[PDB]
From Swiss-Prot, chain B:
NCBIfam families according to UniProt: PRK11552.1
Biological role: Regulates transcription of the cecR-ybhGFSR operon and the rhlE gene, which altogether are involved in the control of sensitivity to cefoperazone and chloramphenicol. Represses the cecR-ybhGFSR operon and activates the rhlE operon. Acts by binding to a palindromic sequence within the intergenic spacer located between these two divergently transcribed operons.
Organism from which the protein derives: Escherichia coli (strain K12)
Disruption phenotype: Mutant shows increased sensitivity to chloramphenicol and cefoperazone, a third-generation cephalosporin.
Protein name as annotated: HTH-type transcriptional dual regulator CecR
GO CC, one annotated term: cytoplasm
Name of the encoding gene: cecR
Domain of life from the UniProt record: Bacteria
Keyword Manganese among UniProt keywords: no
Source taxonomy: Bacteria, Pseudomonadati, Pseudomonadota, Gammaproteobacteria, Enterobacterales
PROSITE patterns tied to this protein: HTH_TETR_1, HTH_TETR_2
Induction: Negatively autoregulated.
């Protein structure tokens, strides 16, 4: 039971790396070897390679959800006040963006990004599980905060597109990781360099918020 | 991974092009755990032809990278030529600089909402996160020159230093807006309710990204 939860945790971590690189042409053999387990553990603990692929998506959704939950709760508390400040709405936008930038310049989330990025261009049931549980709630959370600050309608197609483009700036330092490392000459991100990325994206958000403001 | 000498015959060149198209699809999806059997079947050629034309699966993988570099390079050669005609000007028209930035962005967005470039995007995205010799081929030949050309245009507009770490970061963040409708394709299709892009929807995307480019250009030129 507790022996099995450690085995399951190693299997998910190894599957995330192999699926992230190879999709469903990852092998149970290589997943099990990287996990320090026998190939039978995949069938025993998860049912099949296919079921382990979905458990990888579930793990990613749970991981993002635990990061996202406190931001949603803080926003609900702010909008419960009779007179929220526009400055406080902006601060929620920036705390969400800085938290995403931080996680997306961290080595140990790279396999999560690989797994999701593959599913963005070839979606399976895995993508829709993560989308419904957390990616859509996070996208809508940012769309509504931006609409709340600017005074626009969060459900307008244009607002959704505006927000999507902005999120692309946050994602560019992970999805364009090798491009920006070579172009800056940095061999790796560190705290000082993540702070520069924060300032860059914060600047663009402020400019776009001010331009959209009613 | 090594380069291959070019085919001596038209029929050879055509069969190699069929193999590269199929290999982009299979490598795009599966990386190096793609199979030559599935590549050959998708191409309508034989496994043995991969061996004769390319030598190995890994050499075919590098040929895919080279094809990507040539394709992007030809799409943005006219932009590069126009940028150099501007750069060599003593009195560069700020309006012309902006027009070149917006046209490059609109060309990128258009290509990145076409179905027939998805496999290219799959191939590069995996290489961004797990780079091999393939990424560095494409980077040196076209990605870095295009990235640098857009940075230099933004710097010219704003009056900043194109080699400044700041300008490189601003440019990279901006390019992420242009890539977002491909790299976040499924997210934005579901969030909008669209089942597919089309002319009209791509024009809406272009209007959105253009708006952002203008707001950022204006904001970065303050204090100049
Ligand atoms: Cl297998
Ligand atoms: Cl093979």
């Amino acid at each position: 039971t507790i022996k099995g939860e450690q085995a399951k945790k190693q299997l998910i971590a190894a599957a995330l790396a192999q699926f992230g690189e190879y999709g469903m042409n990852a092998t149970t053999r290589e997943i099990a070897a990287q996990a320090g387990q026998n190939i039978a553990a995949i069938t025993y603990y998860f049912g099949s390679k296919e079921d382990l692929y979905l458990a990888c998506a579930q793990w990613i959704a749970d991981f993002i959800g635990e990061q996202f939950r406190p931001h949603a709760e803080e926003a609900e508390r702010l909008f419960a006040q009779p007179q929220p400040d526009r400055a406080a709405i902006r601060e929620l936008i920036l705390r969400a963006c800085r938290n995403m930038i931080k996680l997306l310049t961290q080595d140990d989330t790279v396999n999560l990004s690989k797994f999701i990025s593959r599913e963005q261009l070839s979606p399976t049931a895995a993508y829709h599980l993560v989308h419904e549980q957390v990616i859509s709630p996070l996208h809508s959370h940012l769309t509504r905060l931006i609409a709340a600050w600017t005074g626009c309608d969060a459900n307008d197609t244009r607002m959704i597109l505006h927000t999507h483009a902005l999120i692309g700036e946050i994602l560019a330092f992970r999805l364009g990781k090798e491009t920006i490392l070579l172009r800056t000459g940095w061999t790796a991100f560190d705290e000082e360099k993540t702070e520069l990325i924060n300032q860059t994206v914060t600047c663009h958000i402020d400019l776009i918020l001010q331009g959209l403001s009613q």
